Amino acid sequence: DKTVLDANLDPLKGKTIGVIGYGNQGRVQATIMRENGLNVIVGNVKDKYYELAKKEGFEVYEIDEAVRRSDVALLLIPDEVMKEVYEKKIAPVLQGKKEFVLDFASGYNVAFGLIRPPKSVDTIMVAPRMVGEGIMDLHKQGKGYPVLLGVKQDASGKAWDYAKAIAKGIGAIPGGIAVISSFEEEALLDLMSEHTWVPILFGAIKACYDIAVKEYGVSPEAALLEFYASGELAEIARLIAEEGIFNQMVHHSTTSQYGTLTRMFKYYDVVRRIVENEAKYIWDGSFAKEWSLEQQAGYPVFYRLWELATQSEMAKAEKELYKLLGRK
């Protein structure tokens, strides 16, 4: 009832498009927009990404120059830095424009009140559900992916059509779909995913390895092969996406079904408590504070935790093994 499976592309036509930030997402999205008959110019600071963009047949102007030239702008730089960059390079140029469309790939900065623009511009959002490195793949298979879109500020009365045209232009639909929502919901959901069932999974795997090796005298090779060094999880996830999370298990053994179901219904309350805590922590705005301050300090915790993860026993063993298998 709140979905789209295809839409138009023409309101983009004639206009000029500016993709600020040629990284994980800017690279892919700009490439596809080019392939869809949309002349896109890139705006980036002077670094290696500048070299790259300039090297892939892109007119890499400076940010403000791009905004000047462009009627549509895509703010594809980290969720952590498009505030310093906003009022210092965009908001001024914005006081000059009157017809301008501004897009995000997330609701972080705006849902938490870090970027509040004026009544002159159209303020939208369109967010994929991939990592970018997994979008090149689907595009090379004539496929599409899902997205979420939402609008905060309707200056021209035409927001939704612009959003849907963008969706079609970057390669989401046709082939996938898109749903309408707020910014709050998008932010909440992305962060719940990033905070609840990803880290829990990783910690459980790590704990299984540690235990099996240090209390049951197992060989690292076998542990790694069983837990994640094999492509089992990938096939399971594909079957989940194709058939259903539960129906999928009809391809497992009954032993697996039974153990999984029992232990799932056995541990539900604990993870429920955890999810409650984290979703509350987010809904308030505490995490955004935590994170912006982590920047302003210089990313110390970031650094140390990367180090601790890559200097763990499991990671060294994985190094040796992946070496053995020729995997890079």
Ligand X SMILES: NC(=O)C1=CN([C@@H]2O[C@H](COP(=O)(O)OP(=O)(O)OC[C@H]3O[C@@H](n4cnc5c(N)ncnc54)[C@H](O)[C@@H]3O)[C@@H](O)[C@H]2O)C=CC1
Ligand Y SMILES: O=C(O)C1(C(=O)O)CC1
Residues 184-213 that bind a copy of itself (CB under 8 A): 185-186, 188-208, 210-212
Q: Give CA–CA dist 217/284, Å, rounded.
A: 46
Q: Which of residues 161-190 bind Mg ion (CB under 5 A)?
A: 190
Nearer Cβ to ligand X (79/122):
79
Q: Which position among 31, 40, 72, 106 is part of the footprint of ligand X (CB under 6 A)?
A: 106
Binding mask 234-263 for ligand Y (x = CB under 6 A): ------------------xx-xx-------
Q: Which position among 35, 39, 271, 323 is part of the footprint of a copy of itself (CB under 8 A)?
A: 271
Contact status: 24 vs ligand X (CB under 6 A): yes
Beta bridge partners of 151: 124
Q: Give CA–CA dist 22/33, Å, rounded.
A: 13
Which of 86, 16, 82, 19 is closest to 53 using CA atoms?
19
Q: Which residues are annotated as a binding site?
A: 190, 194
What are the strands, taking DSSP E only, across 144-244?
Answer: 147-153, 178-180
Nearer Cβ to a copy of itself (39/247):
247
Q: Choose from ligand Y, ligand X, Mg ion, none: what does 25 bind? Cβ within 5-8 Å by kind.
A: ligand X
Q: Which position among 105, 125, 191, 224 is part of the footprint of ligand X (CB under 6 A)?
A: 105
Q: Which position among 37, 96, 118, 244 is part of the footprint of a copy of itself (CB under 8 A)?
A: 244
Nearer Cβ to a copy of itself (8/262):
262
3-state secondary structure 249-298: HHHCCHHHHHHHHHHHHHCHHHHHHHHHHHHHHHHHCHHHHHHHHHHHHC
The CA dihedral of 226, 232, 233, 238, to the nearest 10 degrees, is: -170
- Site residues (vs Mg ion, CB under 5 A): 190, 256
